[PDB]
């Protein structure tokens with residue numbers, strides 16, 4: 001078999017070649033990214049005298065049709081004319097090339113997972129975590145403007161990128177899974193660690209799922225490790241329950257997949273699904289306190305911030321309150337961008 005007259009591999013990806021020139025314009029430097037969507041490459045745009053990131057979508061109907069949605073939303077966001085539009089990556093243009101839809105993005109710096117990794121997963125400071133938190137909240141507010149109503153659907157450290165290596169300004173990338181509040185088309189969405197209870201439970205979802213993901217992200221940026229690191233859905237839900245307890249009955253009562261994780265007693269309350277021969281793996285519900293994970297009264301996560309400025313007890317207590325409001329089980333009462341921005345965690349110095 002030869003795929004796409006030899007230009008593609010067996011997984012519908014374009015065989016990237018360092019040094020190649022496309023359409024007398026783009027010089028391909030190297031692969032910088034790879035996912036289910038396809039690939040991302042670093043490239044120099046001769047015409048515009050600048051570096052770009054080119055997202056090369058897979059040559060297959062299903063992936064193309066999704067990227068067309070991605071392009072529509074990217075263009076709709078970039079088009080919008082408030083100054084909040086610059087927490088979102090800029091889609092410069094797109095084009096078809098050897099049967100691949102290619103999206104051209106401005107060149108940003110590296111992502112927040114790479115940033116975590118540069119400090120050997122010690123975490124970044126609470127001061128820097130705050131700056132990310134403020135910008136992300138402001139960006140989620142943009143996405144909430146009624147004319148947009150976009151759900152990113154895959155927030156995680158990897159999809160938040162620094163603008164410049166030496167500064168805190170960030171932008172959100174990868175709207176390849178995104179949708180608007182009307183036209184939702186998938187039930188199994190978000191990366192697992194950052195997946196909301198509503199999605200785990202098979203319930204309808206709105207823009208609040210991104211705020212859940214942000215809660216999880218912000219904690220991980222400061223501790224250096226994922227808050228809820230499930231190997232599968234059942235593990236994931238169980239790890240959430242360790243920190244936040246059994247979700248409220250009014251939600252589980254409307255949850256198509258409640259019985260995947262939970263069981264309903266005669267009296268109308270819910271427990272975790274009962275386990276084989278009692279073998280214990282999880283901490284009892286609500287026992288793994290965020291208060292201890294963050295190290296609120298014990299010098300920060302792992303004790304590593306003891307006797308540093310910008311990491312007081314009062315600072316942590318604020319941060320913890322914000323995060324708990326972000327991880328509200330109920331998407332109707334979970335904190336929303338406008339009100340998150342008014343939180344005491346952000347208040348001026």
Ligand SMILES: O=c1c2c(ccc3nc(-c4cccnc4)sc32)ncn1C1CC1
Pocket residue numbers: 032033035037040053055089105106107108109110111161173174175176
């Ligand atoms: O990886 C990126 C980069 C991007 C701009 C947009 C962008 N969308 C990406 C993406 C990732 C996964 C799915 N869809 C898009 S990666 C990326 N600028 C720079 N870089 C890093 C090398 C420094």
